[PDB]
Amino acid sequence: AVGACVLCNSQTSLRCGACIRRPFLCCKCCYDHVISTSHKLVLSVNPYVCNAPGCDVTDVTQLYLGGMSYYCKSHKPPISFPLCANGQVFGLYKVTDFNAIATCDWTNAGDYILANTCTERLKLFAAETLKATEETFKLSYGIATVREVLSDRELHLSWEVGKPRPPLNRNYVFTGYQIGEYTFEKDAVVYRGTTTYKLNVGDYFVLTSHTVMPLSAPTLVPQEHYVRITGLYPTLNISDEFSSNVANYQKVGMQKYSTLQGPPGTGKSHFAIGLALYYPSARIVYTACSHAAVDALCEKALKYLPIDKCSRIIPARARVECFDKFKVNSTLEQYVFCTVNALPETTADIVVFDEISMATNYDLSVVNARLRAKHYVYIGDPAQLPAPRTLLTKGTLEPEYFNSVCRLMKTIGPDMFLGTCRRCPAEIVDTVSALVYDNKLKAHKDKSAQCFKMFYKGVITHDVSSAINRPQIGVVREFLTRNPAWRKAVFISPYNSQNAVASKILGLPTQTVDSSQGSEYDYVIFTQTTETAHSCNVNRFNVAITRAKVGILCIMSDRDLYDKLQFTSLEI
Ligand SMILES: [Zn+2]
Ligand SMILES: [Zn+2]
Ligand SMILES: [Zn+2]
């Protein structure tokens, strides 16, 4: 009930009772807060409320100290001092940005801008407040009760009346009733239960609302620059394969933390695993937010690092199937691969945090609190997709506001940049290099002459809000008949409902742009589906077209992105 002020660290017995996270506020900052916001409840050992029987005055600005107790203007004794005076709130041990973080509903982009441009302590207050708001918002949704079980992969649902229905995609995971986590895709609905269970008729599902823990560690530790490589011992015999990253691996040992911007297919996991070969005795913890990112790091480690020194950390709540080729839950192995949410409390010579555009400041802080390392390496790309912000409906969130690492990469630049894309045909590399990389990304491959674009608006229909463009899928079907090599293509679009329709009509494996990030395929067929801020987002567009190793077909809706594609146009 006594602690440090979130704005100036000054000790206090005061906590704001109207703030969802009840932060400690000192006398000067508590005053500036209550006198400028709707927040008037102040908490101490006992709350600041009128002690007179049956009185409901709780507003600190309307209360006084009558001896050792608190009373309003109607109940105070003659000798009483106002709780609010001379810019202070009376307590013990006797902000415009804090006010906005404390009172916003997190539905605007400007709220996330502020959460990332503020002081470090306010970045943690903002991340805690936002995550708690995101969880209390899960309570504000309807329950789905099983009406009829059709097959082992399909069922019918009855929804709660008076409460909205959550979007049925992979971004919304329900907990079944504790009969395992379940996911849904669109009267017949498709069910994907993490645990294989005979889906009982009438049993209910509810979105998991986890408790938001407080943040202690900064999003980024204070930067330290060294004169020599510190606490790391380089090999003198470094494999030719990894020679291109030697100057960068040295930069890593000569700073507390370093940022690496790696565009698609420029060698991020090769850099991450090569860092272990460069400092062969260093204990490295490899972390990312998703199980897919962590597994991709495991796949790369399996090829270069001794398997007996690797461990994949998987929590007892085994959400989805992940990497099976390392000893499980051996926290003490030299190489530990683990998602941010499952991190043990341990130390490391190097912590490598991959897919950094997907991290939030909450994730950045958790890593700093669970892992005490000599060096921290942040690998990702601010030109790729950020983590979904479920509350954000108004405005677009720019890359410089994704998190603290992305803010640094977009303002002062990354410490290291992988400049040569080895995956994509040059048509794709030249397009994204100009689009999001200021012409600094170079192509290793020649033009494949298998990159096509077709400008076709089609017809936009909707499955609630998720969009479908059947004419664009018809154009793909026509193209496939004339281009049989493309039979092996992955169908990509910005919408799951478009992908569900393409799956049935084309039979191609399907992927949203957001679920394709980090993956690569020989051929990609992309249908833009709509002209929305979502389907036109340059980061999403960047990820979409950089999935292709050999060919890409883009059926476009937006003239701007279509005209920028350095692809051969097709007719019809
Ligand atoms: Zn203060
Ligand atoms: Zn408050
Ligand atoms: Zn009173």
UniProtKB/Swiss-Prot annotation:
Changing residue 77 to L: In strain: Delta/B.1.617.2. LRR repeats lie at residues 208-228. It comes from Severe acute respiratory syndrome coronavirus 2 (2019-nCoV). Zn(2+) 12 binds at residues 16, 19, 33, 39. Plays a role in viral RNA synthesis. Multi-functional protein with a zinc-binding domain in N-terminus displaying RNA and DNA duplex-unwinding activities with 5' to 3' polarity. Activity of helicase is dependent on magnesium. Binds to host TBK1 and inhibits TBK1 phosphorylation; the interaction with TBK1 decreases IRF3 phosphorylation, which leads to reduced IFN-beta production. Residues 419-572 form the (+)RNA virus helicase C-terminal domain. Residues 1-105 form the CV ZBD domain. This is Helicase nsp13. The chain holds residues 5325 to 5916 of 7096 of the full protein. Changing residue 213 to I: In strain: Omicron/BQ.1.1. A ribonucleoside 5'-triphosphate binds at residues 262-269.
